[PDB]
Amino acid sequence: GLQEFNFIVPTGKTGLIIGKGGETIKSISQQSGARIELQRNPPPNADPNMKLFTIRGTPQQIDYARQLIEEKIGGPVNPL
């Protein structure tokens, strides 16, 4: 059963999740079993200083991916 978790971070922290090369987001997706989607075309009322992410998986996969992302950015994500 697949579910979704939406969160935001400041645009400047996106690197810490992606990694030099895109190695970090690939490694978190592989270890967790979840997909990690960066919003491609934000609507015009979206804050340009914030970036939306969506974790897609089973709840167990989503929880694990969220904990790995939180280690990298050094604190909790902002949930929507």
Residue numbers in the entry: 375 to 454
Authors' text:
Far upstream element (FUSE) binding protein 1 (FUBP1 or FBP1) is a multifunctional single-stranded DNA- (ssDNA) and RNA-binding protein, which acts as a master regulator of diverse cellular processes including transcription, mRNA stability and translation as well as RNA splicing. Central to its single-stranded nucleic acid (ssNA) interacting function of human FUBP1 is a tandem of four K homology (KH) motifs, namely KH1, KH2, KH3 and KH4, which is embedded in the middle region in between the self-regulatory and transactivation domains at the N- and C- termini, respectively. Comparison of the four structures showed that they all adopted an evolutionarily conserved eukaryotic KH-domain architecture, consisting of a three-stranded β-sheet packed on one side by three helices. A common property in recognition of up to four nucleotides is facilitated by a ‘minimal KH motif’ that constructs an ssNA hydrophobic binding cleft formed on one side by two short consecutive helices (α1 and α2) and the GXXG-motif-containing connecting loop and on the other side by the domain’s β-sheet and the variable loop that links the β2 and β3.
In contrast to the upper part of the binding pocket, considerable variations of the amino acid compositions within α1 and the β2-β3 connecting loop led to the remarkably distinct properties of the nucleotide binding pocket at the lower half, which is responsible for interacting with ssDNA nucleobases. For instance, a longer loop together with the presence of small hydrophobic (A194 and A197) or polar residues (T385 and T388) in α1 of KH2 and 4, respectively, resulted in relatively open binding surface with strong positively-charged electrostatic potentials. In contrast, the migration patterns of KH2 and KH4 were rather ambiguous with some slight shifts observed for nearly all nucleotides, except fragment 4 and 10 that had a high GC-rich content. Interestingly, the potential interactions of KH2 and 4 with ssDNA 5–8, which shared the presence of a triple-repeated deoxythymidine (TTT), was consistent with the previous suggestion on the preference of FUBP1 for T-enriched sequence. In addition, we observed interestingly also that KH2 preferred the T-rich fragment 7 over the TGTG-core fragment 8, which was in contrast to KH4 that showed no preference for both ssDNA. As expected, in contrast to the wild type, all mutants did not show a shift in migration on native gels upon incubation with the selected ssDNA. These overall results suggested therefore that all four KH motifs of FUBP1 interacted with c-Myc FUSE ssDNA independently and individually, and KH1 and 3 might exert potential preference for ‘TTTGTGTT’ sequence while KH2 and KH4 might have broader binding specificity.
